[PDB]
Structures are given as C-alpha cells and as structure tokens.
From a paper:
FoF1-ATP synthase (FoF1) is a ubiquitous enzyme found in the membranes of mitochondria, chloroplasts and bacteria. It synthesizes ATP from ADP and inorganic phosphate (Pi) coupled with proton translocation across membranes along the proton motive force (pmf). Therefore, we designed the δΔN-α fusion construct of Bacillus PS3 FoF1, where the C-terminus of the δ subunit was genetically fused to the N-terminus of the α subunit.
The structure of the δΔN-α fusion region was well resolved, providing atomic details of its binding site with the b2 dimer. As designed, the three binding sites were almost identical, with structures similar to those found in wild type Bacillus PS3 FoF125 and other ATP synthases. Structural analysis using cryo-EM revealed that the δΔN-α fusion and the b2 dimer adopted the canonical binding structure observed in the wild-type FoF1, except for the missing N-terminal domain of the δ subunit. This observation clearly shows that the N-terminal domain of the δ subunit determines the number of peripheral stalks per FoF1, restricting it to one by disrupting the structural symmetry. The structure of the F1 portion of the triple-stalk FoF1 was investigated by comparing it with previously reported structures. The F1 structure was found to be very similar to that of the Bacillus PS3 FoF1-εΔC under uni-site catalysis conditions, with one β subunit bound to ADP in a closed conformation (βTPC) and two β subunits without bound nucleotide adopting open conformations (βEO, βDPO). The purified δΔN-α fused FoF1 was prepared in nucleotide-free conditions. Therefore, it is highly likely that the bound ADP was endogenous. Notably, at a low-density threshold, weak map density was observed at the outer periphery of βTPC, which can be well fitted with the open β conformation of the nucleotide-depleted F1 in the Bacillus PS3 FoF1-εΔC26. This suggests that the cryo-EM map includes two conformations: closed and open.
Numbering used by the authors:
A (entry chain C): 80 to 140, 600 to 616
B (entry chain L): 85 to 163
C (entry chain E): 111 to 471
D (entry chain D): 1 to 385, 391 to 469
E (entry chain J): 6 to 73, 91 to 424, 434 to 579
Write the structure that this text describes.
Amino acid sequence: IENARKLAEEQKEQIVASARAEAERVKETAKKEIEREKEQAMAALREQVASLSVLIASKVIXXXXXXXXXXXXXXXXX
Amino acid sequence: KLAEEQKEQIVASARAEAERVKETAKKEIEREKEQAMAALREQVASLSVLIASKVIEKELTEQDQRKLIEAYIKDVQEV
Amino acid sequence: ADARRDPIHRPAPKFEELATEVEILETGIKVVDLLAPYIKGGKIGLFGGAGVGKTVLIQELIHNIAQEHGGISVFAGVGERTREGNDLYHEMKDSGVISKTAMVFGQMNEPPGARMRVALTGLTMAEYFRDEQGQDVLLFIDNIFRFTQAGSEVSALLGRMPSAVGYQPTLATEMGQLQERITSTAKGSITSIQAIYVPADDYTDPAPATTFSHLDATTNLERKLAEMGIYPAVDPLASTSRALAPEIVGEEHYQVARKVQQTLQRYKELQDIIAILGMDELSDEDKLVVHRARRIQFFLSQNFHVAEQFTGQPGSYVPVKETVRGFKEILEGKYDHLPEDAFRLVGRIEEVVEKAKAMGV
Amino acid sequence: MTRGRVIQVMGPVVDVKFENGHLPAIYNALKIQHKARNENEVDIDLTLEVALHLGDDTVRTIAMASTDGLIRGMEVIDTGAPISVPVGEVTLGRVFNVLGEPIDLEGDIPADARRDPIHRPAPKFEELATEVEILETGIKVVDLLAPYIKGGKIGLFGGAGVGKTVLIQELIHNIAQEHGGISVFAGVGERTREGNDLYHEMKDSGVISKTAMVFGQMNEPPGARMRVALTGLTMAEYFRDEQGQDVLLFIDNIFRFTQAGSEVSALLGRMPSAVGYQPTLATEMGQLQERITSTAKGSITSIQAIYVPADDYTDPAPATTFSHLDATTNLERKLAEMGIYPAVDPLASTSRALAPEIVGEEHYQVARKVQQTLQRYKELQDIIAELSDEDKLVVHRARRIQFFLSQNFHVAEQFTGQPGSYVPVKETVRGFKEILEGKYDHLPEDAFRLVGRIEEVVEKAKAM
Amino acid sequence: AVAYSARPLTDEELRALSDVFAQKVGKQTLEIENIIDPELIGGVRLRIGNRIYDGSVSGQLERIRRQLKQQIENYESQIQVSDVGTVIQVGDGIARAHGLDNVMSGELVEFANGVMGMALNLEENNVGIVILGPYTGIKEGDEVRRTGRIMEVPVGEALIGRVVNPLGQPVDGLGPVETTETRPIESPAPGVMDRRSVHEPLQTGIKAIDALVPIGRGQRELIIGDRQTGKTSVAIDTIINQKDQNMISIYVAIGQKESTVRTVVETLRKHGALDYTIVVTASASQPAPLLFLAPYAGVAMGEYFMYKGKHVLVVYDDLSKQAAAYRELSLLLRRPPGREAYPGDIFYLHSRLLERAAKLSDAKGGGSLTALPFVETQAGDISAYIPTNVISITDGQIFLQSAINAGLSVSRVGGAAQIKAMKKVAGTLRLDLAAYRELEAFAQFGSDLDKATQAKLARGARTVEVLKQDLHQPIPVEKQVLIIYALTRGFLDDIPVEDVRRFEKEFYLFLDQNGQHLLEHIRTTKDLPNEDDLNKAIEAFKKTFVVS
Ligand SMILES: Nc1ncnc2c1ncn2[C@@H]1O[C@H](COP(=O)(O)OP(=O)(O)O)[C@@H](O)[C@H]1O
Ligand SMILES: [Mg+2]
Ligand SMILES: [Mg+2]
C-alpha cells in the first residue's frame, strides 16, 4: 500500500516536472518568436508611425512634406 | 482496491495541476504578446508625437495666430 | 399635509402638576416580582452589557404587558439592529398589538443627528395622548445609551472642550431635558421601560452613572450569571425598587425578599475561602447557608415564551403569591434533599417536584 | 539659488526657510557646514532630515547630531535625495554610523563608490516567492524543534550571561560557510562598552570578514537612533537584489526603535496614543519589517532581540512586534548551569514551521515524540527528588535525549580544542528517531555530550 | 487673468478676449496680463481665478492620452477646462489646499504627481485632503484638480479571479481590469421593509461550526480569538467549500503580511477557488487612509452582485487593524480621544459597515450577503472595548480557544438555518458535549458510579475525537450528519478512542462505495433516511471493520 502510494506519487511528480519543462521550452520558443516579430513590426510600424505622424500633424494643422518629415524622423532616430 | 483508488486519485489530481500549469503558461504567453503589442503602440505614439511636433513647428504660424484667436473665441462661446 | 403637527422641543411639566402615588404592575417574572417589583406609573430601567439579554427581556415584557394594558403604547428604537426591528414589526402584526401602537425607528446605520432626535419624536407622540385624551400610555425605548453616544459624537465637531473619558460637557443637562418630560401629571400617566447599555461592562461610566438617578426600579444584568446558564441574568442584590415597602407589597413578601437577599449576600461573602481552601473547612451553619443559597440562585431562573425557539420549553408565567409561597418553602428546608439541578429553568415549585421525580429521585 | 536659512532652533528640532517653489521633498537630507568667521562663533558640521512642510516656505526638520552653536540665518544646502549609504563588497569588515561614515579609523570610502537611499518602498506583490522554504542553520536543536524560514522573523528572548553573542557568531559562521551568505549587524541604542566588546569578540573568532556592522549609540539624538535599522536594511538589500544571496540581518533591540520613534513623535507635537505611544506605531513597524522578505532572487532573514516592558506581553509595543514574528528562541540560565551549549529551552521555543505540510511527516512525528518525552521527564522531577514501571525507561531515554541536543561549535574551538561540526537536518532527525527507538540504550549518558552526528557518540563511548 | 501664448498678441485681440470673458463670467470689466512663455507654441492657455483653458500643445500630450480609422485621424482636439487649487501644507499623510471653490464633500481630487485624495473638510478658505497613496512626492506649491465624482470603485464580473487594492487597481500584474460600472463607497443600507428572515444554510464544511454554531445566508457572525489560534484557516476552508454552492466569495486582507497574502492566494488557486473569488489587499506598509477604506471597497464590490439576485460572502480578516488605522488617522487631525484613545465614532465606523449585510425580500430580488468579521484579543479578554463594540453589532460569535468554546460561542439566527436531518441529531450531541465538559471539571481524579463513569466520560471522549478535523479537507453535510447520527445513536461505544479517525475515514469510503441511495435520499429530501436501512448499513460496516 505504502509502496504503491510512493510509486504513484513519484510518477505524478515526474509527470508534473515533464509538463513544466515542456511549458518552459514552449515559453522559450514563444519568447524568441515574439522578439523576432517585435523587431520586424518595430521596423514596419516605425515606417507606418512616421506616415501616421505626418497625417496627424496635417490633421492638427503633401509628398514633399512627408519626405521631409521622414528625413527628420530618420535624423532623430540616428 | 482502496490503495489503487488513492493512486488513481493522486494521478488525476496531478494531471489537473499540470493542466492548470499549462493553461497558466499559455495565458502568460498571451499576456506577453499583448504587452509587447501595447509597447509597440506606445513607441509608435511617441514617435508620432515627436514628428507631429516637429512638423507643426515647421508649419507657418502666420495663419495659426488667427486660427488660435478664432478657436479661443469659439471656446469662450462654448464654455 | 393638513393634519395637526407638534414641535419636537418643549419644556417639562412644572412642580404644581405632577401626581405621586405607588401602585404595583405584575410581570410574571419571579426575580422581578419578588426582589424589585415594577411601579404602574414610573420609570423602569434594564441595564446590561453586550450580549447578556436586554432584547429578550424587552420582548418578553412586551408580550406579557402590552396586551394587558389595553391602552396605547409607543415603541422607539434608537441605535439598534435593523433586523431586530423587522422581526418585532412582524411579531406585533401577527399577535395583533398593532392598531394601538406607533413605532419610530432611527437605527445603527443612521448619522448622529438622526440618532439624537428620535426619542423626542416618540415622546411627542405619547405626550399628545397623555395631555389631550387623558389616557394611560406605555413607552418603550430600545437603547437610551445611543442618544448620549450620538450627542458625544456631535459635540466634538461642534467645538467644545471634552469632559472626562472624552464625553460632552453637557451630558447631565441633555439627559435631564429628555427624561423630565416622561412623567405622570394630573391628566394621564406615562409608564416608561428603558433598556440601557453599559460600555465595556463598566457600571461606573459617566453615562450609566448619570442615568441611574432617573429610575424608580432598576434591573442589572451581569455576564458572570449568564455564563453559568442562569437566565435571566438579573443580579439579585444590585437591583432595586422604590415599591419594596411593607405597606405597599405586604408583610410576608417583604420578609421573604429580605431573607432571600440576606442568604445570597452571606453566600457571596464566602466565595474566596471556598475558592482557595474548599468546602471542608466550614462550620455546619455555613454549609447549610451554601446548601440553601445554591438552590435559591438556581430557582431564580425561568423559561420564557420568546426563548422557546432556542431551547424548546413552552415558557412559564408565575403570579406573585406563588413565587412568595415557593421561596418561603425553599427557605424552610422543605426541599433540601432534591438535587440542586432540578431547580433550573422551571416556572413553579410543583414543576421542581415533577422534574426531580422524572430524574429518578 | 537653492539655499535655505535657519529660522528656529529648539533642541533637536530645526526650521528652515527656502525660496518659492524650491522646497525639498519629505525625508530629504540637508547639510550645514560653517567655519567660524570671527571669535564669537564656532564650527558646525550637521545633517538634518526633512519631516514636515509647515507652509509659508518653511520646513520643519529633525537633527542627527548636537545643535549647539547654531545661529539664525546660516546657509543650508539641499542635497536632493535621502540619506545615501555606500553598498557593495566595500562594507564587509567595517563599522559605520547612521550616515554611512566609517567609525573604525581605517580610512574613508572613496568618493566614487555607489550609494543607495535609506528610504524605499517595499517589494511588490508580483515579485515575492510563492512557496515556503526552510533555512538549514546546522544547529541540532534549532533545526529540529524551532525551524527557521527563509525570509522570516525570529524573536530571541535571551539575556546577559546565557550565551547570545556566541550563538550569533555561530549563525554567521554556519550560513557563510555552507550557503555563501553575508551578515549585517545593526545595534540600536547600543552601549559603547558592549559594542567594543562585540567588535573585539568578532575580530577574535574571525567572522568579521563576512559581516557589516552599524552602530547607533545611546548618546545620540532620538532622530539618529530611529533610522539606524534602515541603514543595515539597505546594506543587506544590495546583496539580496544585485547578487541573489540568502542574507542574515541581526537587530540588537527592536524595542529601542519604537522608543526612539515615540520620543521623536513627542518632540514634533503630536497627540499621544494608548499608553503614551506614537499614533503611527503600527505604520512605522510595518514600514520597517515589510522590506525583510524572500523575493524570486534571494532572501533576507532577520533575527531580532526583544525586551518586554514591565513583564507585560499585552503592552502595545510587544503586541505590535509579535504580529510579524515567525519563530521564537528562548535561552535560559539553568540549562547553561548543566553545561549544555547552546542553552536553548526545548519546550518554550516555538515555530509556525513545525507543521506536517512543511517539514514532512517523519520530522514532525519525531519532534512531537521528543517534546512529549521531555515534558514527562519534567513532570517526574518532584517524584524523583522505583516510582513506576515505564517512568524509569522514560527517564533513561530522556537524559540521553536532553544531552544529545548540545553541540560543539566552530567558535568555541579557540577555547576548547574540538573542531566543531555542522549537522544536517536529515542526520539529526535520524539520530533522534534511533535514540527514541532505543537502538543506543547501552551507552553511558556522558558520551552524549558536545558531539555532532550519532556516530561520534558511539566513537566517544568506544574510546571511553 | 493671465494668458500664455506663443507670440505677443495684438492689443485689440487682447481687449476683445477680455471683454468676451468679462461678459461670460459676470464682470463689467476684465484685464488680461499676457505673458511671453514660448513653450506653448500651439496656442493660448488662459488662467483666470482658479480655472484653466488649455492651448494646443497639450493636445499633443492629449494625443498620448488618446493612445486608445487610425485614431479617427488623431480624433478631435477640444478646449478642455478644469478647476484647480494649490497646496499650502503637507505632512503625515494629510494635505491642505487653497482654491477648489465648487468642490463637494467626499469628492475625489487628483494631484499633479498622479496620486488621489479625498476632500474631507470644506472650510471657509481651505480644503482638507486625505492622501490615498505615497505622500513623499507632494510638496507645498503643487497643483491639485477636481474629478467631479464622489468616491467610487469599479465593479463587475471582470474582477473575478483578480487581486486588487482598495481603489480597484490590479496588483497581480496580469494586465488591466476591464469593467464598465462604478458604485459609491458610502451607500445606505436596506430598509426595515426591504428584508426578510434568514431561512437558508451556509455550509462551512467544519463539523463543529455546522452542528453547534450554524450560519445562514444573510447573517453576520463574528470570529474572535487570540493571535495564533488560526482563523485564516477557518476562512480559507469556508471559502473552498463553496465550490458547488452558487456563491460568490470576497476576501479582504487588512494589515496582514503580503507574503502570507501571497501564500493564501496560492492555496486558493490550487483548489480551483479562483473562479468565484475576489481578493482585496492592503498590507502593513501601506498608509492608514488605505487601510481604512478596504472593507468599504469590499462591500461595494459585493453589493453589485447582491442587488441582482445573487448570493455573496465577504470576509474581513481583521477589524482590529482597521480600528487602529482609523484611530491613527483621527489623532493626526487633533480630535479628542476617548476610552483607550479611540475616537467617539469608532462604533459608527463598524456599525455603518456591518449593517449592509442583509437577506433581501422577494420584491427586491431575493439576494443576500453574509459577513464574517475577525477580531483579535489580548490574553482572551472578551470584555475589552472593540470586542464588545462588535459583539453588540452581529448575530452571534465563535470563540476560538488558545477548538470552539461552546460556553461563549452562540448563534441567534442559526437554528432556522439548518437542514432537518442535522436538526434532528444536533441536540443529543450538544448534550453529550456539555455532559463531558462539566463532568471532567471535577472527575479528573475521583471514582464515580458506573453511569457517570462511562456514559458521561466515554461518550464525550468519543465525540471530542470525532469533532477534530484536518486542513483543507471540508466534508459534505450528508457524511457529517451520518457520522454524527451513528455517534449519537450508540455505535463506536466498543471502538477504541485511538481508532475513531480511521473508523470515520473507512466509513466514508464504504459510503462512497455502497451508500448511494442513502446519500441521494438525503441530498434530495433534506431529511433522514429509513432507520432500519441506516442500522443495517452501519451493522454491515461494523462487521467488516477490523478493530485494532
Ligand atoms: N431569557 C433568556 N433565555 C435564554 N437565553 C437568553 C435569554 N436572554 C438572552 N439569551 C441568550 O442571549 C443571546 C441574545 O442576546 P441579546 O439579548 O440579543 O443581547 P443584547 O443584550 O445585545 O440584546 C441569545 O443567543 C440567547 O441564547
Ligand atoms: Mg438593547
Ligand atoms: Mg487574522
């Protein structure tokens, strides 16, 4: 009885450890994927943010002003 | 009999705990993704604010003076 | 909106209008009927701590008296539980005491200004009947301590220098201004029964000490007696009545009550030496005193009608003569052989005999 | 520019007037440094801490030293941050005061070091540890009957002449040797003679290389003795957070902390609370004790000595401090008079970690059985000084059990000769279980004296 | 009357604006003192009296405020106005300000730092503010503005399974809470003609409470004892036991240690009790103003469910720490103290809170709210100030001994809040417990007749061994009543007292195996099953039992 309970507890603990380790591995893969997506979206949505910034300034207040604003944003980033 | 039933109960409880841990990890990943999207939006908003400020500074204020006077009169009427 | 309305504030009746006389009101409670009988036109007080039985005693007195009165009654509840008022309203509506009762409620959840001026509304409602129809009015007050407590809360923000224990400088003046309008003039009478709270089980606090001086009969409940299971927990030595005179209640009643009090006091004197040494180092007369005192202390308890839902016993009612007879027999050593436990929670002494018989003795 | 000037001086309380919209924040540090201009003046070097904003550009502050010689109108400098003390490996083996300046005459800390503010909020809810762990001290009686908890609070009810400064040194030594931790000792309201004695003891036994020391003396203004524990706390937090160690923090008397707070509150003109204490007693205690936690990186474990006023355990100060404690440890004289070291009371000492869900089921059962046996032996003393059947066996087992709780320490070696040992919890539990079963009932009782594991008593018996 | 503009405005425009504002405000004439501040390049920011009209630069910052088509093309910018004041005093957690003309009593104000406060006293030329947060960032000369709302908290079902502080800000780090409703912290209680008597049981899962001190849905029961008597364990077991019952639980921790709160939340999450629980926390290092609003925030969160027809249960982990925080706050305002230095309205502070628990009538919906306040004593003194203050508010008490003390623990409403099956068997158990309790007082060393020697001692010892329990293992009412019925009917009298726990465990196993009809009859009828069948089952178990 005690031996069977100990075996069941050991198997349960091993299963829990395996599940936690698999979750950690999935978390590492998800973190890497999220970082790569964050960088790519940072570039793309930074271009989009420059365009939307030109649009927002115009709304609060064409192509040449947008190009000048893009150059200014690039200079600020640099 | 009873010992095997207790073993099965322990196994079921461990399985439920593992499933809860898996759900918590999935929710943590979703929360991380949501926070990353929010941070990207915040960075985009800050860049938009900076670029809009620069553009508005570059814009001519000769008509902006009259626009500000008109907006002040409108706000006076509204309030 | 066209009904007649009366102001809340007015002066007290003068010296040339009151009426002084003592009659006895019957309640059906042994410890109250014997050692501290109630007056038919005065002021009665029930002092108590927290959770000792003020509400149960109030409800029992209402049940016994308010129907027999056959006049008018007013119930004012200041600073008490709202569920208690909800229960009492439905109990009265079932029993039928309504249609001759008016109720006013300002309870625990109300600001101090409301809890201060609620007793005055019921007072005005009773004064109308007394002074305009010449009736006999009953007045119940759920807890008169909350009135002074709310006054104390307000006086701090009014900008007044605090008195002892932080109370207001005007405690006695406010108490007297309230309590001097509850009198019996030449037209009618107002019998007022009031329940008074004792903070931290301290009877020397300014508020109970100040309110002690306005009462004709008082009833003090102690937590030590309630912890032993004795119910009600009235202290038989600290409860007083102005009607306990030989010419008012009789001559047998007076002697019986005095002897009972004397034996209880003598038993009280021997508690420390029993605690330390024991019962083996006493004289025969002292052992006899203890033997009768335990029986008397257990026979002062009773089973109530309103307490049936707690225990199960139907409840009891005892007239005065039966109480005097039973305590006279107890003092004579007639029932000295029965077990001391047969005396608890019974109405009369024949019930004591029956309970001892069913106990195998 | 950003210069204040003194307005009022009333003993340890000062008022400073500043410019409009340039007042310092609450808890900042202000500096007065004056050189005698003429023969009618003196030199001043003083530090003040902001307490209240009184309005009209005036700030009320408390002083950290003597205020004799102050003149109305002297310039005051606003530093812009609270008291900042140096932290790192540079503070190990040195003695400091409340301001972080060394007082051991070994030089000054270079001006390019890193310093940390005294006042800080507690760690957040999401940064704490979700489980309960056990700190393995290596002392048999403490590890078996009153276990310690990482990030917990322990109350030491000792005294003079029971062996307290030896137990402290043993704890420092054991933690540093086995776990790699660091120790900080803060002495609040400390007599100078006893501080000197403790410093020399630590230098003799060699533990001074692993511990930092802070002293707030009995002859300091009430403001100084109120903020000494925070300096040790912020010295330990560096090792907890930056490195991730398990750190020990000793507080010499937590009662003098509350007394200094009450004196400061009286000086500032506040309405006293019950029994004359400050209105903010619980808030101050909680702000001190909530920074001693176990986060996801490391942990700080605090051992504090408590004095009980008037032998009243319901007094506001002990009642407020007892709601934070996780364990207690009582030292008693007669246990020392029998030659038992350490002189820990095995029945008065308690702990909330002695539960089957924390220490398992074997440890719990062994501890309870030992306690019951010792209680029975204590009961039988009146009869003893052939009574019954099982009482003889009870006494026979209890003498051995009581003697086996003693131990040889690495800090008593310099006085005795024996190397000193470190006994793991599994080993001590197994030894006590075997003694309870009676496997070693055929040995003299003196063999069970000042040894480590259960093999050493067998070797002592064999050689004796 | 001062304007901030990017460029010096023309005098004619200044005159026109001044005349317009003079006409609008209600003054015959008005003069503007324009400034030359160049930072505000967007437009003009006016400050007249204690009112501000914003320019256009703030709109860019308002753009960040509109973080949230493409923001409706930066949405639209409007001239937002606000009423302001300035601080003139700050210290120990209480401020004091000028301005704020049209502020209300009990309103919420916001400091320039970001912290919030209450408007407490409106004096002739002053406002007293209580700071709900860290006050070391507020200095005299700072700016404070109104919000226009009486104090309130966010309420809804989005709060279920979260840990928050008394203002509704999450502290577990799982993200924002998405609610859409609010409720005032100070609200009136249900009236006399809105309630009804309590007639439903609340099952704790603990035999001693469920049999001796029953609790009903809509009651107010007090749990009182010394420190280190373990009342948090009682609270956690009661909260865990409500898994099947349709109940919503709320746990409020006042003045506790954040580490113990962390471990309690971990214990709750293990047993799956976070699907119906909200946790409100204010630890020992937080300001007294925050330690004093936590019970009100909890009750405000509970009343949202209560006034929809649902059933709620609220736990206040210590009222004796709320009392101390309120005394500290009121002594800093220089109010005359009373007994034990407590203020005069320390009774009102608790009576106004515990009167919001009620059993609503059927015209109001039929909801309920149960309350379980905690009070901690010193050396078991039940006649102190605060313990007697709270004993006179509730409907009973449960005194824990440093193990329920049945001589002082009582329940008024309970008795009608019990099922018939337990009401039939509780009386005998109470009498046996009393018999042992008084007998042991003198019969420690003394011979007795066989009646008092066995029937008055062995039965009591067996029932005292039965009443024990273990942590985090609540018991269903059917199993509870079955074991109590067996004990009162007379079995176990030939079972050694060292084997009753194992007897009970094996009896539960036998029941779960082959007592389905008994259990279903109890669960469906709320009455005892047939006595012959019960005796037959118990006899079969006794025959199969291996007595040691
Ligand atoms: N006459 C009585 N008989 C039996 N029990 C009583 C009696 N009076 C009070 N009690 C006990 O006291 C409790 C109620 O106390 P209560 O009267 O509400 O206190 P308070 O003094 O605050 O009104 C009940 O649970 C009941 O057990
Ligand atoms: Mg009352
Ligand atoms: Mg608690």
